[PDB]
Amino acid sequence: SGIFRDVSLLHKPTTQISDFHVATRFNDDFSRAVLEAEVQMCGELRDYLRVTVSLWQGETQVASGTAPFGGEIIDERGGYADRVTLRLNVENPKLWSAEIPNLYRAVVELHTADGTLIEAEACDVGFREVRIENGLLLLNGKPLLIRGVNRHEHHPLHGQVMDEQTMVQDILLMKQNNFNAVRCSHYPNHPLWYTLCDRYGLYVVDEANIQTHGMVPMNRLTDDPRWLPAMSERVTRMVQRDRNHPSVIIWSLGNESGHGANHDALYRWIKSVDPSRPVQYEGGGADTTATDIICPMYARVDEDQPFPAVPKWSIKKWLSLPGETRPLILCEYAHAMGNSLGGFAKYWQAFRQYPRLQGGFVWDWVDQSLIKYDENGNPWSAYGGDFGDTPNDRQFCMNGLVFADRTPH
């Protein structure tokens, strides 16, 4: 507990940019793109107010557009007087991917007609399309093979406080070991994480801070309409924050909270506000109406585990169940606890052979051990139960591919 992320002060003008959304649409062979930027304002509307959106490739301006406020008519009562949408044509765009993280810079200027700047906001833009077609997750028209890992925010000394150096160290080690994807298990991350994933090139699953694993049954809160407000906030405010990051390719509704009606509602909310990213969620059997991707945890390659209500089928078998058409990407697989990763090769042989088996996220990146000091003041790695907490679950917090200090297993 505590104040474990940054505290800051921000000064905005009274007349201000209050929100902006960046979209990139493409023609059939990705040789032409349109950058669409919706900008919202707060404060007093004046006829002399303007928004300029410029796009930059390094130091070279590729496009620019200016418009006064006033959106298109949307219903009987007119449109948004406090909004404007700018559209910029981009020929032969340099496309973003984990392989080549090509980035542009979009600059949003709020100003007056005479050219006096009020304020500016900006973001990194990655020209990429994410879609599921014919049962395959495609990035820029090509089927992904997810070499992923789950990564909690953990430091052996500072706990759940994250820093740039630790983040960069993780990304370098991940990419040096042929990972191209990360799952934010199980919450929105420190804001810098996404910036670094944009720039270094990693596919991100951004996950709402909703886990109710201790509930009996697991969906007791998530099927309760009285908990829909609280859950909606955890999903909506995540999307509102992170929607402009190119590295985020998939939204997740949370983790291990069963499957409730609130999941279906919030699944639809995201599909409505952001059609650019698939939505996934594992709860309630990994293949519910709240997920675009079959995303089981610890389903085996060839071996069925036919649990009541929530079976974990063989991943090869799961794909071809009567009526099933979706891609399968394990949200968690290959539990890396201690001397482990036995049978890891069996997954990858299956991933390569089966088009619709598109990889998964290893559990997990780093051991969640903390440093304690003995009678002599010497450091040692401590797990659950070493701090005096009871009931505890012993060494079950250490399931990482790297030690807490980032030394490889």
How many angstroms separate the first and last alpha carbons of the chain? 29
314 binds, among Na ion, a second copy, none (CB under 5 to 8 A by kind): a second copy
Closest CB to a second copy among residues 134, 340: 134
Closest CB to a second copy among residues 306, 342: 306
Q: Are 311 and 287 in contact (CB under 8 A)?
A: no
With vertex at residue 241, the alpha carbon angle to CA 238 and CA 242, rounded to the nearest 5 degrees, is 85
Task: Select which of 109, 207, 282, 332 is catalytic.
Answer: 332
Residue 316 found at the interface with a second copy (CB under 8 A) = yes
Which of 37, 189, 164, 18 has the alpha carbon at shortest distance from 105? 37
Closest CB to Na ion among residues 231, 297: 297
**Between 387 and 406, how does the x/- string for binding to Na ion read (CB under 5 A)?**
---------x--x-------
**Between 325 and 354, how does the x/- string for binding to Na ion read (CB under 5 A)?**
--------------------------x---
32-42/49-57 β-pairing:
unpaired
What is the Cα–Cα distance from 252 to 286, expressed in whole angstroms?
A: 12
Kindly tell me which residue out of 323, 377, 388, 391 binds a second copy, with binding defined by CB under 8 A: 323
Rounded to a whole number of angstroms, the minimum distance from the CB of residue 348 to a second copy is 15
Rounded to a whole number of angstroms, the minimum distance from the CB of residue 307 to Na ion is 20
Task: Select which of 76, 256, 282, 324 is catalytic.
Answer: 256
Q: Are 184 and 153 in contact (CB under 8 A)?
A: no
Residue 356 found at the interface with a second copy (CB under 8 A) = yes
Q: 207 catalytic, yes or no?
A: no
What is the Cα–Cα distance from 59 to 123, expressed in whole angstroms?
A: 15
Q: 256 catalytic, yes or no?
A: yes
Q: Side-chain half-sphere of 384: how many Cα atoms within 13 Å?
A: 12
Closest CB to a second copy among residues 240, 325: 325
Kindly tell me which residue out of 34, 122, 136, 337 binds a second copy, with binding defined by CB under 8 A: 136
DSSP notation for 248-303: EEEEE--BS----HHHHHHHHHHHHH-TTS-EE--TTTS-STT-SSB--BS--SS-
343's CB contacts (< 8 A; 6+ apart) are: 301, 334
Kindly tell me which residue out of 308, 322, 342, 388 binds a second copy, with binding defined by CB under 8 A: 322
What the block records as the tokens of 245 is: 């990051």
Kindly tell me which residue out of 95, 357, 366, 404 binds Na ion, with binding defined by CB under 5 A: 357
Q: What share of the chain is helix, strand, coil (3-state, %, to 5)?
A: 20, 35, 50
60 binds, among Na ion, a second copy, none (CB under 5 to 8 A by kind): none
Residue 304 found at the interface with a second copy (CB under 8 A) = yes
**Between 326 and 355, how does the x/- string for binding to a second copy read (CB under 8 A)?**
---------------------------xxx
Name the site residues for a second copy (rule: CB under 8 A).
Answer: 134-136, 304, 314, 316-317, 319-323, 325, 353-356
Give me the active site residues, please: 256, 332
